[PDB]
């Protein structure tokens, strides 16, 4: 579920940054009540994404890494096509949960398409002026 | 999001049939008629509509939502998404893109439509 994804991603990021993931830190990151975190952590434990501080299983590690990649890729996509930086995080936080892997792969190809030659970015800019 | 899907469907039904029955909305969204009635009251109260007729505010929004939906399908289509995946993705992402992102996506679509070479170059990337 979208929510589950947000928690897995935040948990992965906390562990990578701090070394560990406190319920309290997840609550702050997501702007939710700790009860909401505790409930989700239970579903995550049950579904074998983590154990119990919280330690991701190999499945939870793989999934979290892909979720962070997806986020970064999506920000990079919106940045390249020239969306105002302030708007990017909010849009990615929403759209990330509704793109198939197929779309994400194709978006990956599109980002590499532009990154591989700045001249295509300049042409995109030229279109934006028109 | 919820309201957006309702206004979009209501608009399309009116353009398509000439009117929007609660039962047709219920079927289009896979919700129960009791939910449609509740929503319709909100849209009446929020002044998107007035059987039921969209106000100028409702018709302008419905048209924009339709444009955004079609634009997003055309975008995913252009960048090579399997046709069968496209609708479900558009129905989800459409609600969480700012106008800024939609306009840039539109520029991006025009970018590819201007030169078939650019599409050829993207297909080459995909193979690589």
Swiss-Prot record, chain A:
Binding-site positions, Mn(2+) 1: 6, 93, 96-97
Residues annotated for Cd(2+) 2 binding in this entry: 9, 71, 93, 96
SMART domains: HTH_DTXR
GO MF term (any one): DNA binding
GO cellular component, one term: cytoplasm
Phenotype upon gene inactivation: Null mutant is very sensitive to manganese. Mutant also displays increased sensitivity to cadmium.
Localization annotation: Cytoplasm
Activity regulation, free text: DNA binding is strongly activated by Mn(2+) and Cd(2+), but it is poorly activated by non-cognate metal cations, including Co(2+), Fe(2+), Ni(2+), Ca(2+) and Zn(2+). In the strict absence of divalent transition metal ions, MntR has a low affinity for DNA.
Keyword Transferase: no
Stored InterPro entries: DtxR_MntR_Metal-Reg, Fe_dep_repressor, Fe_dep_repressor_sf, HTH_DTXR, HTH_tscrpt_reg_MntR, Iron_dep_repressor, WH-like_DNA-bd_sf, WH_DNA-bd_sf
Primary site of residence: cytoplasm
Domain HTH dtxR-type: 1-57
Alphabetic keyword roster: Activator, Cadmium, Cytoplasm, DNA-binding, Manganese, Metal-binding, Repressor, Transcription, Transcription regulation
Highest taxon listed in the record's lineage: Bacteria
PROSITE patterns: HTH_DTXR
Chain sites annotated for binding Mn(2+) 2: 9, 71, 93, 96
Record-stated family: Belongs to the DtxR/MntR family.
Domain remarks in the Swiss-Prot or TrEMBL record: Contains an N-terminal DNA-binding domain and a C-terminal dimerization domain. Contains two metal binding sites per subunit, site A (corresponding to metal ion 2) and site C (corresponding to metal ion 1), which both contribute to the metal selectivity of MntR. A large metal cation is needed at the A site to correctly orient and position the C site ligands. Smaller, non-cognate metal cations bind at the A site, but disrupt the C site, blocking the full activation of MntR. Binding at the C site also favors Mn(2+) and Cd(2+) over other metals.
Quaternary organization: Homodimer.
Job description of the protein: Central regulator of manganese homeostasis that regulates the expression of both manganese uptake and efflux systems. In the presence of high levels of manganese, it mediates repression of the manganese uptake systems MntH and MntABCD and activation of the efflux systems MneP and MneS. Binds with high affinity to the regulatory regions of its target genes. The manganese concentration required for activation of efflux is higher than that for repression of uptake.
Protein name per its UniProtKB record: HTH-type transcriptional regulator MntR
């Amino acid at each position: 579920t979208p929510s589950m994804e947000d928690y897995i991603k935040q948990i992965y990021m906390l562990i990578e940054e701090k070394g560990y993931a406190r319920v309290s830190d997840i609550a702050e990151a997501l702007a939710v009540h700790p009860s909401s975190v505790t409930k989700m952590v239970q579903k995550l434990d049950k579904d074998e994404y983590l154990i119990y501080g919280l330690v991701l299983t190999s499945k939870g590690k793989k999934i979290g890494k892909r979720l962070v990649y997806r986020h970064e890729l999506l920000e990079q996509f919106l940045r390249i096509i020239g969306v105002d930086e302030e708007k990017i995080y909010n849009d990615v936080e929403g759209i990330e949960h509704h793109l198939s892997w197929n779309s994400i792969d194709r978006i990956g190809d599109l980002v590499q398409y532009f990154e591989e030659d700045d001249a295509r970015k300049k042409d995109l800019k030229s279109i934006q002026k028109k």
